[PDB]
């Protein structure tokens, strides 16, 4: 059993985060399209677009099913349903993360190897880098289908069980490496190399210094609290799991999906002016 005195806070938190993601990504995606009906649909806009789609998928398939679940006391449906939900909850993480990595590698390639003309084609609205980011987000989510089932936790709930030696430890640490650590290193490395190249050639240096700090700082501040609590719960068998802040921080993963659009909509002047003109 649970006290509504705390459960109400979980429901409120998820409700606030749900609208924050949905509104912010929809607004920027609309303004982008309001320009995109014009000419001058630049490659930077393709990455900003697909990033917002990945962040809406976080809203619709990570946060909303969690709220609809946690508003009820138990997952009111069959195992054949829950496995699909637990799978789709995970896709949003990998997509939102690797869209940022793909966008940063493309910026590096465009500026640090200017003469390297990419051989393969592109659409107006898609690139092979984006498709690889989606493809891996679908593939890596698959283990959710083995982890979760309806089980007789007690009368039943949709529940995870792990082989004890590998345990939660192996799986949860692998997520932290894949979603939090490695993308941060990749983003930081590329942004440092861009700075060095431009500086070796200034407002372009100044803007590079501003955005590199914002991106790497904000990215860490969103993910580090969630993954810290998740790893602690996985590694410490007697963590204060029932403690109110611990319960709340366990939910907070989608916070990063709120800040992403305002950052790149701020630096993209073609989008910034589009928001100022509504």
């Amino acid at each position: 059993t649970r006290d509504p005195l705390l459960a109400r806070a979980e429901l409120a938190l998820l409700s606030i985060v749900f609208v924050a993601v949905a509104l912010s990504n929809g607004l920027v995606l609309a303004a982008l399209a309001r320009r995109g009906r014009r000419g001058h649909w630049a490659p930077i806009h393709v990455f900003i677009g697909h990033l917002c789609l990945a962040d809406l998928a976080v809203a619709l398939f990570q946060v909303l099913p969690q709220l609809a679940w946690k508003a009820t006391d138990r997952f009111r449906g069959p195992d054949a349903l829950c496995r699909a939900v637990k799978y789709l909850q995970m896709v949003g993480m990998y997509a939102s993360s690797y869209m940022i990595l793909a966008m940063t590698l493309d910026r590096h390639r465009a500026i640090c190897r200017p003469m390297l003309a990419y051989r393969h084609g592109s659409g107006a609205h898609w690139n092979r880098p984006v498709l690889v980011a989606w493809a891996f987000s679908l593939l890596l989510s698959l283990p959710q289908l083995f982890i979760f089932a309806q089980r007789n936790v007690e009368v039943t709930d949709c529940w995870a069980c792990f082989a004890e030696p590998w345990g939660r430890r192996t799986y949860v640490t692998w997520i932290a490496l894949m979603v939090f650590v490695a993308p941060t290193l990749g983003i930081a490395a590329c942004q440092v190399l861009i700075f060095r190249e431009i500086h070796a050639s200034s407002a372009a240096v100044a803007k590079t210094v501003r955005m590199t700090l914002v991106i790497v700082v904000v990215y860490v501040l969103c993910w580090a609290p969630f993954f810290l609590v998740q790893l602690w719960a996985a590694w410490d068998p007697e963590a204060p799991l029932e403690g109110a802040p611990f319960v709340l921080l366990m939910l907070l993963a989608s916070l990063n999906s709120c800040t992403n659009p305002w950052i790149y909509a701020s630096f993209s002047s073609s989008v910034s002016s589009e928001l100022r003109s509504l």
Binding site: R2, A7, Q62, Q66, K70, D73, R74, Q89, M90, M93, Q144, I147, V153, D157, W159, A160, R168, Y171, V172, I175, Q230, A233, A234, L241, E242, F246, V247, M250, L251, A253
Partner: peptide, 9 residues
């Protein structure tokens, strides 16, 4: 809780 059981239910 997205890849691990929540503390409560």
């Amino acid at each position: 809780c997205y890849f691990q059981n929540c503390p409560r239910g």
